[PDB]
Copies of this chain bind each other. A is one copy, B any other.
Amino acid sequence: GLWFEEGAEERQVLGPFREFLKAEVAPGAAERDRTGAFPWDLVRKLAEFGVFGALVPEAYGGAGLSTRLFARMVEAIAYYDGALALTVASHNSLATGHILLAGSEAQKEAFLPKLASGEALGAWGLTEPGSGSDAAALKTKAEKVEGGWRLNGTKQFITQGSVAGVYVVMARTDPPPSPERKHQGISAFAFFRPERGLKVGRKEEKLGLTASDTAQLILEDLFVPEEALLGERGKGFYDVLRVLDGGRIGIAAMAVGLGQAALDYALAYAKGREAFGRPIAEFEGVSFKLAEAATELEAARLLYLKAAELKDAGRPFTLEAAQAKLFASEAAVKACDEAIQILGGYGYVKDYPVERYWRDARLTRIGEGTSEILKLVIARRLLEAV
């Protein structure tokens, strides 16, 4: 198999994985989108495929898979269930990926094994009501007290926020030297679900990804031990950036999966549905949409595979991960909107899955860095190289 194709090893894993997804995940996707019922049943089963500890090395109880293979597994999941894919992508990339990145040997031995097994799902709290793109503008604070820390603040839109067993939260431990350096003085804290000090806010009704747990977290004089400190004090934001680079590859894979599903459905539909004495696929008004979407999704897949490769190769991939997520999310939503158009009135009804594909994919242009933010990251990298 050529680089861009699934290798022998990849398809031996992805083949049965896809079969499992078709039989156990696809059937309840439409219902979960309506009820928002978290798939505790599927989490248990996916954990067995090492899906919840995919990048965690076996030494800590993980699957030790590569970024490339995991990215493809996320795309396969998203194809059948967007919410589940966000659940998997975020769990692995943010909470887990952050502990794997800055955690001390002791912290990794304590947290990784439980995250990797699905026993403890990971929530990663960066965003707050008053800051999203400008993440370093967070107001949560961590006061140094006898024996550890006391945290106070609110996190917004945290996935796995209400179902998490392990929480990673960013808070200011020191004042910034200047306003343009507010990213300094921020630290990260890793801890197990507190018995008190952490309450979840009102559930969030979302446009899509209904079964994905997203919640507001309110920390009230929450005490965490000295061992909670993750990474160097005051330099937590630097780790956040690194963590976000990795997560963007997964979100890009997620976008591609939803777009492909929408494209596959519109293709099949256009081939069967007929108008004016022939399949509507025979009208360029329809076929051109399919051709453009397919071309962009393929380009998007190549981009995320490339970004995954650079990471697996221990090489910088900030620019490449930003480009993949930006291109994939934009192309995927576009493809999904066109699939809706192609199905006509049926694209507007919940009896068919394309309207859901669009609603689910739509978040990919917002989460882990809006398209606008990513264009800034890309341009900056391009400009300093000049």
Q: Which residues of A contact B (CB under 8 A)?
A: 2-4, 127, 131-134, 137, 156-157, 179, 204-208, 264, 267-268, 270-271, 275-277, 281, 283-288, 290-292, 294-296, 298-300, 302-303, 306, 309-310, 313, 323, 326-327, 340-341, 344-345, 347-351, 355, 359, 362-363, 365-367, 370-372, 374-376, 378-380, 382-383, 386
Q: Assuming A295-B326, A340-B362, is B350 touching A207 (CB within 8 A)?
A: yes
A7 to B: closest C-beta gap in Å: 12
Contact, CB under 8 Å: A284 / B372: yes
One complex includes copies of this chain to the number of: 4
With both beta carbons as reference points, the residue of chain B lying nearest to A372 in the complex is identified as: B285
Contact, CB under 8 Å: B379 / A288: yes
Q: Chain B residues with Cβ under 8 A from A4's Cβ?
A: 3, 302, 306, 309
Contact, CB under 8 Å: B286 / A372: yes
CA distance A380 to B137 in the complex (A): 26
Q: Chain B residues with Cβ under 8 A from A179's Cβ?
A: 277
CA distance A3 to B302 in the complex (A): 11
Contact, CB under 8 Å: A382 / B290: yes
Contact, CB under 8 Å: B344 / A133: yes
Contact, CB under 8 Å: A299 / B284: no
CA distance A306 to B302 in the complex (A): 9
The listed residue (B284, B298, B341) touching A365 by CB distance below 8 A is B341
Q: Assuming A2-B313, A341-B371, is B267 touching A383 (CB within 8 A)?
A: yes
The listed residue (B276, B281, B284, B300) touching A134 by CB distance below 8 A is B276
Q: Chain B residues with Cβ under 8 A from A313's Cβ?
A: 2
The main secondary structure of chain A at its interface with chain B is: helix
CA distance A271 to B205 in the complex (A): 25
Q: Chain B residues with Cβ under 8 A from A277's Cβ?
A: 179
Q: Chain B residues with Cβ under 8 A from A300's Cβ?
A: 299
A310 to B: closest C-beta gap in Å: 7
Contact, CB under 8 Å: A207 / B349: yes
Q: Chain B residues with Cβ under 8 A from A294's Cβ?
A: 323, 378, 382
Q: Chain B residues with Cβ under 8 A from A207's Cβ?
A: 340, 347-350, 355, 359
A378 to B: closest C-beta gap in Å: 4
Residue of A156, A157, A362, A383 with most chain B CB atoms under a 10 A cut-off? A383
With both beta carbons as reference points, the residue of chain B lying nearest to A209 in the complex is identified as: B348
CA distance A350 to B283 in the complex (A): 33
CA distance A97 to B250 in the complex (A): 41
Contact, CB under 8 Å: B281 / A284: no
